[model samples]
Target: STGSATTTPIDSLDDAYITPVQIGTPAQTLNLDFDTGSSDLWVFSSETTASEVDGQTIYTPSKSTTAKLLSGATWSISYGDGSSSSGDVYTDTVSVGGLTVTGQAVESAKKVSSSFTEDSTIDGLLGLAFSTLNTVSPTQQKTFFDNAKASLDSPVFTADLGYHAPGTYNFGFIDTTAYTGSITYTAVSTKQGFWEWTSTGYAVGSGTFKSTSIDGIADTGTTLLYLPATVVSAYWAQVSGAKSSSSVGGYVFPCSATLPSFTFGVGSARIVIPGDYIDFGPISTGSSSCFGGIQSSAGIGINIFGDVALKAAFVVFNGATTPTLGFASK
Candidate 1:
């Protein structure tokens, strides 16, 4: 688990972590973050049009003489976090780490962006997260991973995000600063385009909510957990006052008291969402602010485990392996 990132020989097909691609002519090398929830590959550059860039990274077309911005394909990405950006479309030779593939299509959000809305700031996203959700899928006409498969070390590729750090995942090969072991991955998440998952039980404070089966997804792009109202109320009920009135209204119990621990099932693992993330006691309705555990979604339809929960375990997705997210040690 702790070694160097040595490229495996192109024998006995092994699932590649990130689908490496070449962009531009002497293509700029980058390992795109494949995302099913998003549709663009954004990068940061020193030459981006100032008015066009939000807070996201800009991939400098000027840096690569071979870089070519599309004459008409311009794009703007929005995130759930209330942010946005726009940039021109451009063709570049994109590559992952050391692998080189030619004529790959890439979207350079040059002008402005809301990566805070879509996700994190990396070089660019590969958009192999899903073909349908991909912004470039229909226009450029191919998913980055799907089109690059033929030239890969293996036809199958996997994402190991949240495998380390605060999150137990990685984009490719557990995001190692160093190491590559022979790995066996499970099928990718099929809970829908989202990283939907199910829980076999729930726990609030010292009291556990006996085997309450639940369904949801793992989303790193999302920073917090959005739980169902009933689930949240039940969770808070175990807290001291169970409810409190606050200026924020609803779901908020404006108390500085240390909240009790809450947890949701993760396969066989039970993850605790620290008390600093809970609110309850004395009131018909209250708010826990956005403590940390399961908070009310006002009914967002689907429940989310989110990046914080994901940080607790090793999460992997095998879009190429089939439909099911794989689990492993970080």
Candidate 2:
């Protein structure tokens, strides 16, 4: 049967969005961050240490009659931001919206880093990245999207991110009504378990389009846009009072600075990031300085098109054999 689902953003703060996922019989629901940067379906669960849980709502497998332990299987993950979680495995039914998958691998967290424990809002992560990157040990597991794709009208999903407002994530079909322009398609390289692509060039504000290829991943889980050191420095150069502040972390600039728009060349289309989106609020309360949303990729091998850049365009994560990305103006 052709099926579909629409995911609603949990909160717009930090540009994070979450969707409700039901796991196991009787349907234990949890709010999860749908991440495209990694492949692992992990959640805060009864197994989590009490001190580390804080205000998170944990999933209890004991309450689900259909839950089965995947003996000896475990999963541990560390994010670029230093967040981490480790846990045992269980096989259960995981459902998202109207789509359902039986025997889906679920990582039940027993330990978590402070970075993850502090954020009580994010209950877990629903990984949409290629299943080849799944962190499950002993055996790899397919992602929810991968397992349910065969039952969909098309192996496709679209992310429509909003600016501090509600956004929509559509699966199985493209909603042409959500976008204004023709969708420009580009090839994606899944070798890295990310929606990685190359930008033909870039242009700052009304300046000339520069022809320099930049390879990066479309990461919805990341809050800021990370570019190569050179590219980041180039953009910051145009703004006055902007400096890489060690104390504040990353780059910071005077709140009053007039920022210019940044544009990236994507296949035949160009996605422009408005200046307002570059200012990531104030560095601190009662401070005249604000942090820049665009920063250096540095340690990360590839650049990341995070929420700062992604919210500027409508993105489609095509899951067919020849995976591709479709972008448009929302």
Candidate 3:
């Protein structure tokens, strides 16, 4: 079986991509952030603190006859940005697009951070990372994809994230028309429960490619592309008024600065991110200095090929026994 869903950007900056998910027996549809950085299908629900609820939809398990509490099970997750949520677990019928997964673990949030409460655009997160990263206690729960893979035509999912437009997430089978050019495959390491891989090298705009092996994760949850300090410096150097400001955080440049495109190698294939995509936007409402979409991953511990890079290419999270990642130009 297969499923297809449209993921839309929540904001102008493409901060995150949200997709509609049907949870419970009667199918309570909620817009959830499809995050590839973590594993745990959590949602805002009746169990959540009323104060934390904003304009988001909440899933009420009591309304579904098929919903059952996963007694003694609990889950909690925190992101690099400090946003977090914790809740009790329940098993219910979960569906995405046309695909259905019975007895899918659905975490009901009881507590949420302020960041989540303030963001009314997304009701929760649907993680796509390996189930190894699931934060459930007592017993780890498989991700929706993991649970549904057994019946799928193929255990694979594709991420086609867009800059400012809506993109798509395809499960079970690859959509040939979703991408262009031949796909470049690379080995993936699920050691850290992430879609982690190494890039052959990178190039600053029209400059020569640097044959540096950079390890990073394909994280749809993150907004920016973070690379080594040296590489980030090289890209920013090309801009006349660019500066690394501690006060403003990361690298910032004049709004009018002429930006350069960034290119990264995936085996023999190279994917180029347009310059305009790198100029994230002004640091403040009317500020003349704009933040960069690509920053140094020095303190981040690991490099991240986030939405900034993923939006520029088609990414495949192949779930074979020995998983591999595929990248194609779109």
Please give the TM-score that candidate 3 achieves against the real structure: 0.99
- Candidate 3: clashing residue pairs, number: 0
List model 1 lDDT by residue over 81-191, tens digit each: 455545566666655554444455566654445433233234455554455454542264355555555565444443333321211222233443322332233333553
The lDDT for every candidate, in the order shown, is: 0.50, 0.86, 0.94
**Which stretch of 10 consecutive residues in model 1 shows the poorest summed lDDT?**
8-17
Best by lDDT: 3
Q: Which candidate order results from sorting by lDDT in descending order?
A: 3, 2, 1
Q: Which ranges of candidate 1 are over 4 A from the true structure?
A: 1-36, 44-49, 52-57, 95-104, 110-128, 137-192, 241-255, 266-290, 328-330
Q: Which is superior by TM-score, 1 or 3?
A: 3
Q: Write the per-residue lDDT of candidate 3 for residues 1-330, one digit (tens) a residue.
A: 999999999999898989999998788999999888999999999999999999999999999989999999999899988899999999999999899999999999999999999999999999999999999999999999999998999999999999899999999998998889899999999999999999999999999999989999999999999999999999999999899999998999999988999999999899999998898899999999999999999988999999999999999999999999999999
Quick one: best TM-score, which candidate? 3
Candidate 2 has which clashing residue pairs, if any? none
Off by over 4 Å in 3: none
